[PDB]
């Protein structure tokens, strides 16, 4: 069988140092130069790396330089395979990626050597087998050894990293761009919703993040004259329109009095400037293509999906929310970028994905009057908890 | 025999770049699955760009080169030199939007053409009850495609005035001149309305009377569907209405002597009316729409009243979104009764759902909510 | 593959108009001329329709005249085609059955064409698609727009019903031939169980039908010198005898004082006539074997069934309590009949089949002293509800 | 090698005769199934005609000439001039009772050397402890045949009256003279008794007490067969009920040496008596009624007593019923103790039947009831 | 097919009455001469029944005597057949189990006769079926009535068998070897634990089998200056230990006043003589070496194993307690005799296995203080029943 490796893989990790000295050092990290498959690669990773450890930067001459002095230069192919190897990166940047699969490779090679090695142990070294016993065992734990990957972060950066953490709770405000909810909270925290970015709630059991959602919904929509398109999959237009009346002035079995309360409601949003959708288990791809529509003729300002699970982007098999939820996710911030507005979606609660690696903030709702929200992940700003009143619906 | 609806050129153009961009892949997904491309190899492909993606891993072409390798389908798909051949097929990468769209476009039809020719052979070969054969049949196509604007809220709020308007201050008549009519201008046309009623002793009555009322005292007409009980079963209740006789028969022996003037007159002003039933158990989505549509074409039709692990509770829903189906299709107002033991998918199709002496609350709208 | 059709029933249905004219009305119900598969057979049924349609009655002689106009005559085989057409239906009673199959090959015959036209139209009409999505869509919906059966039976008709059958409730007492309980009930309601009839009392927990129907049993071999049959394939014999003299005549864990008042009832039974058979799970074969046996010698009157449900005459798949205790239904009344006597049959409840199309009256019993017998069906008798009252065990 | 039992001029009188009269098939079905039928067609057809009937459709040769034109095995079974064929083999048609009687006939023949040859085949290469297959085979044979008159009630009254005779004013001999021996007159001749108790403190006392009184004090012979305990557990428990002796031994050490005297006493007179005890955990059936057959041939037979989702309530009652049978098969009064936690079939094949100071009542008969 | 026999296992049984004649009791027990398959094996087997009917003893030339008046000796074969049959005997002892499988091999023969013969019986004979119906019926059930295997051992023997067990249980002491708890109960009652033999202490809920055992454990390792070996796989060395400490002198979540009291008992077991062992799960095997090594270097004296079932000595499929549970218990057996000295196992219930028919003693324990030891089997000595007051640990 051939041997489990990658040559153009390491192609890529190896050129890719070309491109950028930055990419050596995080290959150096995974690899050592011997860890190559073809003996020209590791000559190539040895040499750059004896010749970035004189000093001396590496460009496509210097790493020919030392690699002359050996001259093992007509060996790996001349200058001439160094620049081809800097054309077979795809892209020097995730170098580690490309390094990983080598590490990969090159590490089960051993796997591979290593056993077959005890294979042979096994039909000639019958003379004491509790040696064995103990001896080959030993060998596989030696093969988990060589895997390069992990280093504790140490305690005293995130010492420093809380500190400068509060230190960046420590400024003024200035809202950039987006206005939302009473200011010491995402207003504040976060200069309210910045644009591009995936914002996303956590609820849990009965969703007050419908409520809060559209909260910032209308204010984002009666304060501002930015247009907010809501897609709530969950329910009725009508239904979300009225429930958003008696948020904003003050039942359900009644016979009112102050219709002109009501009035004074739905006069509120005669600014409008909101366009909700319901249509339930909407396609994610409809979520884009409907969403872009408005923003080329009238044009958007943010998105507000009530419910980031009914959306279901559709495909192939389930495999417990996770795998088609992850997709999604990274279907909405592929959105959110080429949208340009911040999106928030709403979850809850019973790693319900990938979610969080795509979220730019991600905030959980928590109480039991008084209700906090707690900001958790804001990439580019702070950490953070904030409270608001909530009484009934406000 | 002919050659299938092939979208290559579209597809390689997608296929190549995904290998451009990483946002070209989300997009292409966006859309469709690798089980829709054509050619072998484009699918095994673009089956392992997302099991790369799915990984967590970036795409660009060395991660699915290599993944590719593994489970060895590289040799299989065309080598990295095919690989390489996609990249170069297209310069920029933004338009695979409407590219890959091409690509889906044409995995339908060869998803219809499929999905018809599978209703052929299954014509000439199995004889199970055209009722149903026919039946799947349209269902099969329905599964097909429908899955593979926004809203004007300052005109929602129009639709939240509207009915303020009924909230204080007719269009398909219901029952007397109470909340009800008032509560939904009529109670009428192409939409579906559901009134639940738990084991409340058979709340069939209030639908009924509304029908009684519909054909004997609008003069428009009618049609019931009781797949439970008998047509006399009822016809003897909607007595029970009119005469109110404390009900029964068998009062005196064959009836009362003396009240058996109400019955000459309570038959007699019902006879009038037109009414149409039928009671077939168990019969409900495809045949109601059969047989009202040929009620419709001959007299002109009338308000409809129907009478009540994973393969149960979404052949419910199936038939709930029929009957709103047949609504529309019949510009027809139909009225279904529901259980109490939710019960599925109702609330979400349905238009004014109603729940149910006593009082009735109403619930979502098409006008004044709850009262 | 060739085409959905039957040929053979066509020509029952044509040929069973010939035999008799009733037939062309429920024909051209369900079907329409060209609705034939065979040419020939569409122009013999048009040709019937438009000569039956001029008013003058349709004979071998009328239907060949009509047909000659046009001259078909030579091309549907001749008058000898048209004959033999009328020797090849097997019985023009059913003629719907034989239409029912025609209506459906061909309906079905359609189904075909369509799809395969959509297919067709699949491979060369790309130019628009979401068109094809709604078209093909409704030529589906359209094929299953043309099977004629179907008619809602008006609300006139069934309230005059509802009325001649009060009318019919309406009259005086004359019991034919059966003689059971409390004259009010089954007796004047419905003559006291005819001949040939298969009767049917549904029960429900704690069988009540058990003692009604061997109260009805020994009333009929007390009163009249009948005798009556009765497998009890529940309880045994002695069990079922004695339960029936404390029932006639006044216990259990008891020294009786009064053992004259139980041979006033042992004595009552001294007339006798009923010969009780209790052999549990009995096969309905042996059911009319052993109970005609006794016709023959002694002589009948009628026969009573203690469960409908445990017979079980065997064979096949037993599917669902439907097919098997259906093909016995049907073998209890094609017994009653060929036993020209009664037969009650008990059943209970937790569409128990398709008893009732085999019943010719079926009871239920209903309360909670009193009790009500509520008799819904009885082909060529009234409706109707009749209490009896009923204590312990009388 | 040679000829099965075939019975085609009989099985086509049936095929037939059902083309002429509805009736004719139920009579058919009355006693047959298709699977009966010998020639591949003649199934076929018998079976295709039941399902239209099934249907509900009526089946005169088109229905049935049309169903088996669906699924497709016209052609297969000899096409409708065969079927035709049938028809004519017939004049008149209802002699089919007798005439399918035949056809059943020849079937149980062919069902009975296919069975019994199974055992043959079976025995030459399982060895899967004998004692199971050659009981197994007993069992096949029995599934063969039984499964494939009325009463005198005049004479029922009769039992009634005999009945009465005892509750007011001996053949097997029981307990001391109390409402036992009268209640059955004796207790006695091959028939099944069950005597149930619930976990009542293990009621063997009253099975084994009277087994002693059989022996003992009546001067028959009894087996009892004790599958829970020892031998020697039970004698020694008899012994208390001898010398009435507060039980146990270690009352004083080996024994209480003023009462030693009891002890012969009562082991004197329980020596002279025949009783018969076997224990062997786990065996009731066959070695059971083996055992009794070879001490009945030998001394003369006693009364025997024995102590103690779908596939174990069905074995209770096989055993159930052989215990029934194999009281008949040898003219012996079998009674068997059962637990209360009903637990079976055991009230049907089960003669007098009772439920168990206190007292105890008396069930289902052949003498008087309960008391 | 090669009709069902073993030749050889009838020259077993044949010539292991040449051996011993104890054999044609037991032979003759279960198999009659005819019974056998090859043909001179039956002459010989009713040459020997008939020479030792006339009273004469069997020998290698009585049986030939016999044999020889009818002239079948040339026929079976010789003198020369008779002696070798003599030595195809593996072990004259268990004769039954080679008789037995000659009565198995041709009783099932004559299981294929009869059923052929029904066969037959059933093409042909189509005369009458029901008479076939009980008549095949019978023919089988007679086949079950030729295993002559069974018989009553009456109750006559089973009386005197009581007597002179409660004779047996009137005896004085002199505990032999062991010497174990209160003298009334093991020591007494028998001798104190033999050598070799299995002893099995039956437990039940809350296990106080293993205070029990390890008070036998210390009694015999205090007392006598045997070396007691005791397997724990249940519980800790060190919780043992201690557990038996407050066992000999008396208290867990404590700060003790007495540790004197607990130096007594610490001090107590300074003879020690007790070598413990706790590693879980021990394969049996290991149970066997180790338990021996100690023998052959300080000398054993008796083991104790903490619960039966954790042995699980490994292998094939477990096959619901009982298989391996059996292999396992008779490989106790066959150590506790290959290492001369008893050994106690403790069990407890929810035919364990088949550890009775191992076993030299069960014993039980019973009660609700007091409680009481109840020993049910004890090849050799009496049955009996003996209390011993409790309390806490003692
Ligand atoms: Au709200
Ligand atoms: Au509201
Ligand atoms: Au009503
Ligand atoms: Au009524
Ligand atoms: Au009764
Ligand atoms: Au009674
Ligand atoms: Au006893
Ligand atoms: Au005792
Ligand atoms: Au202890
Ligand atoms: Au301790």
Same mark, same amino acid.
């Given at each position: 069988?051939?041997?489990?490796?990658?040559? !153009? $893989? !390491?192609?890529?990790?190896?050129?890719?140092?070309?491109?950028?000295?930055?990419?050596?050092?995080?290959?150096?990290?995974?690899?050592?130069?011997?860890?190559?498959?073809?003996?020209?690669?590791?000559?190539?990773?040895?040499?750059?790396?004896?010749?970035?450890?004189?000093?001396?930067?590496?460009?496509?001459?210097?790493?020919?330089?030392? =690699? &002359?002095?050996? @001259?093992?230069?007509?060996? /790996?192919?001349?200058?001439?395979? =160094?620049?081809?190897?800097?054309?077979?990166?795809?892209?020097?940047?995730?170098?580690?990626?490309?390094?990983?699969? /080598?590490?990969?490779?090159?590490?089960?090679?051993?796997?591979?050597?290593?056993?077959?090695?005890?294979?042979?142990?096994?039909?000639?070294? @019958?003379?004491?087998?509790?040696?064995?016993?103990?001896?080959? @065992?030993?060998?596989?734990?030696?093969?988990?050894? %060589?895997?390069?990957?992990?280093? *504790?972060?140490?305690?005293?950066?995130?010492?420093?990293?809380?500190?400068?953490?509060? +230190?960046?709770?420590?400024?003024?405000?200035?809202?950039?761009?987006?206005?939302?909810?009473?200011?010491?909270?995402?207003?504040?925290?976060?200069?309210? *919703?910045?644009?591009?970015?995936?914002?996303?709630? $956590?609820? %849990?059991?009965?969703?007050?993040?419908?409520? *809060?959602?559209?909260?910032?919904?209308?204010?984002?929509?009666?304060?501002?004259?930015?247009?907010?398109?809501?897609?709530?999959? +969950?329910?009725?237009?009508?239904?979300?329109?009225?429930?958003?009346?008696?948020?904003?002035?003050?039942?359900?079995?009644?016979?009112?009095?102050?219709?002109?309360?009501?009035?004074?409601?739905?006069?509120?949003?005669?600014? &409008?400037?909101?366009?909700?959708?319901?249509?339930?288990?909407?396609? /994610?791809?409809?979520?884009?293509?409907?969403?872009?529509?408005?923003?080329?003729?009238?044009?958007?300002?943010?998105?507000?999906?009530?419910?980031?699970?009914?959306?279901?982007?559709?495909? %192939?098999? %389930?495999?417990?929310?996770?795998?088609?939820?992850?997709?999604?996710?990274?279907?909405?911030?592929?959105?959110?970028? @080429?949208?340009?507005?911040?999106?928030?979606?709403?979850?809850?609660?019973?790693?319900?994905?990938?979610?969080?690696?795509?979220?730019?903030?991600?905030?959980?709702?928590?109480?039991?009057?008084?209700?906090?929200?707690?900001? &958790?992940?804001?990439?580019?700003?702070?950490?953070?908890? /904030?409270?608001?009143?909530?009484?009934?619906?406000?």
């Amino acid at each position: 069988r051939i041997p489990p490796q990658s040559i !153009e $893989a !390491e192609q890529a990790v190896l050129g890719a140092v070309f491109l950028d000295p930055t990419a050596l050092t995080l290959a150096s990290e995974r690899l050592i130069p011997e860890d190559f498959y073809r003996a020209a690669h590791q000559k190539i990773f040895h040499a750059m790396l004896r010749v970035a450890d004189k000093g001396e930067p590496v460009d496509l001459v210097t790493v020919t330089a030392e =690699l &002359a002095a050996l @001259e093992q230069l007509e060996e /790996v192919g001349g200058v001439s395979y =160094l620049s081809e190897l800097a054309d077979s990166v795809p892209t020097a940047a995730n170098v580690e990626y490309y390094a990983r699969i /080598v590490e990969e490779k090159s590490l089960l090679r051993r796997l591979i050597r290593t056993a077959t090695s005890i294979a042979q142990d096994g039909y000639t070294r @019958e003379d004491e087998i509790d040696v064995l016993l103990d001896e080959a @065992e030993r060998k596989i734990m030696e093969v988990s050894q %060589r895997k390069h990957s992990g280093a *504790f972060k140490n305690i005293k950066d995130v010492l420093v990293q809380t500190y400068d953490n509060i +230190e960046m709770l420590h400024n003024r405000n200035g809202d950039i761009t987006g206005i939302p909810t009473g200011f010491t909270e995402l207003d504040r925290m976060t200069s309210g *919703f910045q644009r591009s970015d995936l914002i996303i709630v $956590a609820a %849990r059991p009965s969703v007050g993040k419908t409520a *809060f959602a559209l909260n910032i919904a209308q204010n984002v929509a009666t304060k501002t004259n930015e247009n907010v398109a809501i897609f709530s999959l +969950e329910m009725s237009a009508q239904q979300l329109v009225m429930r958003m009346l008696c948020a904003e002035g003050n039942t359900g079995k009644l016979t009112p009095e102050d219709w002109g309360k009501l009035t004074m409601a739905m006069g509120s949003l005669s600014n &409008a400037g909101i366009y909700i959708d319901d249509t339930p288990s909407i396609r /994610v791809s409809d979520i884009r293509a409907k969403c872009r529509r408005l923003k080329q003729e009238s044009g958007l300002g943010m998105v507000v999906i009530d419910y980031l699970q009914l959306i279901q982007g559709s495909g %192939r098999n %389930r495999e417990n929310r996770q795998q088609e939820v992850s997709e999604i996710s990274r279907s909405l911030k592929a959105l959110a970028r @080429e949208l340009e507005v911040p999106v928030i979606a709403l979850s809850q609660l019973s790693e319900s994905g990938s979610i969080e690696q795509d979220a730019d903030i991600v905030a959980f709702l928590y109480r039991d009057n008084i209700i906090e929200i707690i900001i &958790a992940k804001q990439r580019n700003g702070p950490v953070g908890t /904030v409270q608001l009143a909530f009484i009934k619906e406000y």
